[PDB]
Curated annotation (Swiss-Prot), chain B:
Glycans are attached at residues 33, 57, 93. Changing residue 77 to H: In strain: Alpha/B.1.1.7. Disulfide bonds join 41-85. The lineage of its organism: Viruses, Riboviria, Orthornavirae, Pisuviricota, Pisoniviricetes. The chain holds residues 1042 to 1146 of 1273 of the full protein. This is Spike protein S2'. Changing residue 30 to H: In strain: Kappa/B.1.617.1. It comes from the Viruses. It comes from Severe acute respiratory syndrome coronavirus 2. Subunit of the fusion protein that is processed upon entry into the host cell. Mediates fusion of the virion and cellular membranes by functioning as a class I viral fusion protein. Contains a viral fusion peptide that is unmasked after S2 cleavage. This cleavage can occur at the cell membrane by host TMPRSS2 or during endocytosis by host CSTL. In either case, this triggers an extensive and irreversible conformational change that leads to fusion of the viral envelope with the cellular cytoplasmic membrane, releasing viral genomic RNA into the host cell cytoplasm.
């Protein structure tokens, strides 16, 4: 707010418009970055209220309808670990996608891969029982279906325990 | 990577200072609900499909490929047998046709 | 207004239900990628002094 300074600044031409154009250019692509990572679903897919997935327990990755933004348990654990203005010219512009909408994106991406599998990324979302989804994903790595079906209860317990340890390794390890 | 759906093939087209790819993809459509089972019980043995899923039109059980509805009768050639019929949960009782018995008689 | 993230959809999931396509559509979609920009050069001495 110094007029004798701002008049002198015009003598340098168009540095000020270049700098603002560059910062606006890298502020728009910060929203493009989030859009191309999360906005990959045509529709908001939902999880069945009754959660019978053959023994698999996605309680710590699925949303909780009591928590802020209905964040999942691991998502809430993640938002409490990172938490560690305007004076003269500096102005932080808010992100276009609020954390609630990014959480809805990750809930839809996660509820479509549980119910429909990998089909909702290639067309119409086709439902399939989760145990049978695991069987065909076992086929993908070279193991036959019967290895999943005859060890289903062991496999579900291992998966649930592994999710539980992700929760612990995040809740404690700084 | 190359377009939405299952990639079939792509065609390049030159552009002033870039390239335009024409991604030809396969998009499934016109789906139908069905009933499935992990495996078929026959003679105290469990039968799993070699390549496909077990589906039923409400009355009869079929073996179809997983991306296109082409039901076929459950024979011992498009299934394989592994284990007894009490460990897989979701087994359904049904007949597995054999292409050797009819000729023998 | 507040953005709608998309149309709500619930997949009819159950422990013994599948959906299998009966037809298909062959779709062709474009994707444009820049590969090069204009080969320019400036004479530092001529630009500055002239």
């Amino acid at each position: 707010d110094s007029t004798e300074c701002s008049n002198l600044l015009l003598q340098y031409g168009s540095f000020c418009t270049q700098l603002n154009r560059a910062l606006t250019g890298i502020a728009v692509e910060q929203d493009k970055n989030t859009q191309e990572v999360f906005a990959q679903v045509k529709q908001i897919y939902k999880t069945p209220p009754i959660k019978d997935f053959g023994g698999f327990n996605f309680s710590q990755i699925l949303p909780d309808p009591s928590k802020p933004s209905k964040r999942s348990f691991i998502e809430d654990l993640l938002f409490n670990k990172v938490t560690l203005q305007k004076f003269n010219g500096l102005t932080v512009l808010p992100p276009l996608l609020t954390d609630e909408m990014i959480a809805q994106y990750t809930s839809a991406l996660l509820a479509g891969t549980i119910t429909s599998g990998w089909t909702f990324g290639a067309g119409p979302a086709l439902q399939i029982p989760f145990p049978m989804q695991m069987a065909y994903r076992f086929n993908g790595i070279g193991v036959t279906q019967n290895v999943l079906y005859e060890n289903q209860k062991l496999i579900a317990n291992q998966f649930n325990s592994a999710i539980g340890k992700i929760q612990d390794s995040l809740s404690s390890t700084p | 990577f190359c377009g939405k759906g299952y990639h079939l093939m792509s065609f390049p087209q030159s552009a002033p200072h870039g390239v335009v790819f024409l991604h030809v993809t396969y998009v499934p459509a016109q789906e139908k609900n069905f009933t499935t089972a992990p495996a078929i019980c026959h003679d105290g043995k469990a039968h799993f499909p070699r390549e496909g899923v077990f589906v039923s039109n409400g009355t009869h059980w079929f073996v179809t490929q997983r991306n296109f509805y082409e039901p076929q009768i459950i024979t011992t050639d498009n299934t394989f047998v592994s284990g007894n019929c009490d460990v897989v949960i979701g087994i359904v009782n049904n007949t597995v046709y054999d292409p050797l018995q009819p000729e023998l008689d | 207004y507040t953005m709608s993230l998309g149309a709500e959809n619930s997949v009819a999931y159950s422990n013994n239900s599948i959906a299998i396509p009966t037809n298909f559509t062959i779709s062709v979609t474009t994707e444009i990628l820049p590969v090069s920009m204009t080969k320019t050069s400036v004479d530092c001495t001529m630009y500055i002094c002239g």
